[PDB]
Design a protein around this ligand. Structure first.
Ligand SMILES: O=c1[nH]cnc2c1ncn2[C@@H]1O[C@H](COP(=O)(O)OP(=O)(O)OP(=O)(O)O)[C@@H](O)[C@H]1O
Ligand SMILES: [Ca+2]
Length: 426
DNA sequence: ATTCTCACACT
DNA sequence: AGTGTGAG
């Protein structure tokens, strides 16, 4: 098994929240700009950055005041706020615009508010038979890069792209409808069409990767951004992985990836090929070890899930520093604000998607604790009523209050979280 | 003191 | 059910 059975793409909207704001406010187009939340603290936290501003060093996680030091002419758009918290509706609605367009071409897996995996295997098979056996012109691939080409015996970027594409298409075996490289190329043709449709019908640009699985497609998508697509063939994997830091591969960006590096004494994905599957299973567990053994050879089997809608709907707010909640009536009021935005989104979900959540997950963070969450408790979600959820959420957390007072909350809360789960068809 | 979602493995 | 990891 060479892991070449499928054609999978990953589409990523370029600096998505910035694009939504630039479409709305033309004064922001083709300018260094960023999208910010919470204007009062250090000018707002940056959550999205246009490519013109990235050339000044502006990134996410930065404070707007700091970003303005790197880029004095940075323009800012601020996220809507509703009931004291950032409100992402505008961006979720734009996300829906794009996913509905993608769904015309293939079945998609929503991966995040601005990326989707695309399973193109069947679409490719139908384009191949409609294609008689005539050649794929480079005109059908006007923004595609072939990873690893050109090679062998031009100083500008578009020149290189074309030379790589010409070498690929020259050597393509169009008479063999079962060559995986041919299937990828047809897949790339379809993704060009899908990206043209997205830009025509929404004004939004995106990048894409086309490969044989989700991990290679995601890696490919990042190789030539913005507004370009990249085909990573099975054959391109040994050279690509030979200098690819382990942490770049999806799921290895964290503690497991650091353990792979430290325990094995390696730096690059390709270096994993020298270990047996049992060796990797002994260090990292049966599942992780088998996964790493196949993945360093370019092979991964995670399916594209036919799922365009999230499985949970959640509402959280952080209260860092001196703003940590300290009174019972503070905690009730913020629980109510979260439960009100949750009710709004749930009722829209019951009208748009014909389902009802049935479990309510309540989570809190305590000043001094270390982790994303300190505690998770659940109860039934029987009615989409903000006052009832918020009452119920308090009920299941009210005993975490270590204070002997009834009107004080010790120790102070640095996060409230409400999440609706366990949907059933309605 | 960036923040906020959402998915899944493990137990 | 509750915790921990990883991602956009
Ligand atoms: O580190 C994060 N903490 C919280 N939330 C994040 C983070 N990272 C990403 N998000 C969310 O996921 C959207 C698009 O995530 P993204 O990585 O695809 O970033 P962009 O499209 O802006 O730029 P690209 O680099 O893709 O061109 C972001 O706006 C935001 O909603
Ligand atoms: Ca993106």
């Amino acid at each position: 098994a060479t892991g070449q059975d499928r054609v999978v793409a990953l589409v990523d909207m370029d600096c998505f929240f910035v694009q939504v704001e630039q479409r709305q406010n033309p004064h922001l187009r083709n300018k260094p700009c960023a999208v910010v939340q919470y204007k009062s603290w250090k000018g707002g936290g940056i959550i999205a950055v246009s490519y013109e501003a990235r050339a000044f060093g502006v990134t996410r996680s930065m404070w707007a005041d700091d970003a303005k030091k790197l880029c004095p002419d940075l323009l800012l758009a601020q996220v809507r706020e509703s009931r004291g918290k950032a409100n992402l509706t505008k961006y979720r609605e734009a996300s829906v615009e794009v996913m509905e367009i993608m769904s015309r071409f293939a079945v998609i897996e929503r991966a995040s508010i601005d990326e989707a995996y695309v399973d193109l295997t069947s679409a490719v098979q139908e384009r191949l038979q409609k294609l008689q056996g005539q050649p794929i012109s480079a005109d059908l691939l006007p923004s595609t890069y072939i990873e690893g080409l050109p090679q062998g015996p031009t100083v500008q970027k578009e020149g290189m792209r074309k030379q790589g594409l010409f070498q690929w298409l020259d050597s393509l075996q169009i008479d063999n409808l079962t060559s995986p490289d041919l299937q990828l190329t047809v897949g790339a043709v379809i993704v060009e069409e899908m990206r043209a449709a997205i830009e025509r019908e929404t004004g939004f640009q995106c990048s894409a990767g086309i490969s044989h699985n989700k991990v290679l497609a995601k890696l490919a998508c990042g190789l030539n951004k913005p507004n370009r697509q990249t085909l990573v063939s099975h054959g391109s994997v040994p050279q690509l992985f030979s200098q690819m830091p382990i942490r770049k591969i999806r799921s290895l960006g964290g503690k497991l990836g650091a353990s792979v590096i430290e325990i094995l004494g390696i730096e690059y994905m390709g270096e994993l090929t020298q270990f047996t599957e049992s060796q990797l299973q002994s260090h990292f567990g049966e599942k992780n070890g088998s996964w790493l053994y196949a993945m360093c050879r370019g092979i991964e089997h995670d399916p594209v899930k036919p799922r365009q809608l999230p499985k949970t709907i959640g509402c959280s707010k952080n209260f860092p520093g001196k703003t940590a909640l300290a009174t019972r009536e503070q905690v009730q009021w913020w629980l109510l604000q979260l439960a009100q935005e949750l009710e709004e989104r749930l009722t829209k979900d019951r009208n748009d998607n014909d389902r009802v959540a049935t479990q309510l997950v309540v989570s809190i963070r305590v000043q001094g604790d270390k982790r994303l969450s300190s505690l998770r408790r659940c109860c039934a979600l029987t009615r989409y009523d903000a006052h009832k959820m918020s009452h119920d959420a308090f009920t299941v957390i009210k005993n975490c209050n270590t204070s002997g007072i009834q009107t004080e909350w010790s120790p102070p809360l640095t996060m409230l979280f409400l999440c609706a789960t366990k949907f059933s068809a309605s």
